[PDB]
Specification:
The structure is a homodimer of 136-residue chains.
Chain A: H1 3-12, H2 15-18, E1 20-21, E2 28-29, H3 34-44, E3 48-53, E4 56-65, H4 66-76, E5 89-92, H5 97-106, E6 112-115, E7 121-125, H6 127-135
Parallel strand pairs in A: 2-3, 5-6
Antiparallel strand pairs in A: 1-7, 3-4, 6-7
Helix pairs in contact in A: 3-4
Chain lengths: 136, 136
Amino acid sequence: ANFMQRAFEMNDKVASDVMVDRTSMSVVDVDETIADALLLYLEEQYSRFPVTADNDKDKIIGYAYNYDIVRQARIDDKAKISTIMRDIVSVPENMKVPDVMEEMSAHRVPMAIVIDEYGGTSGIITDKDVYEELFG
Amino acid sequence: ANFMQRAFEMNDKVASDVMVDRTSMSVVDVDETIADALLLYLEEQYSRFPVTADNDKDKIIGYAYNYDIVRQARIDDKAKISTIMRDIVSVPENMKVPDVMEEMSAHRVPMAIVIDEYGGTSGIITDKDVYEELFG
């Protein structure tokens, strides 16, 4: 019910309990142009988009930040996502939530990619997903 | 140093321990244009700005969402912030942190304005300020 309990529950949860699952993700490709990313943002609002290699959801190489997209479009919207892309951290489905949070912190990324046993993509996690568990 | 210890502490903290104080807030005015607002976003990067009345930081009447700003800038950036402004909530300085996230939730807003005893602006709270507390 209350916050301190939601905190306790979440303390024991793992990456796969909290993540946005692979089937619900919206991605952009390393070879799409900024202009493409811009139109995607305007349509879906997410502030961070996982960037795929080879148009493969199972090959997330980083993320693109909405700020970076709208800023660069004013400059040269034909540039490729790769010119703005920034790093992520990957974590196994079974990592305890706080351990992922700390991984995101040690690596200084706002996105963790949850990976399966084969190294495919199970889903992703960001702060917005943590705030849902703690505050419905 | 760990999550559960960080959550315990925050549970006992008050709206003013955690807010962004008035001196650090960035505002836009209700009579400023989208064009203005876009230039601010591009310069300062926050995703939400408190919107003032009469250019007064002590009269916050809502917030402006970056998504609304970039989206509208493309249609008619001469439009005024009031055309896209959305609702806030206000809380007293001494309201316990979990209780405010609850007010925010109840009133479906992403921002609380922390009020002083005269009704002036003490500061603001958004999810981000919560994460800095639990994560960072």
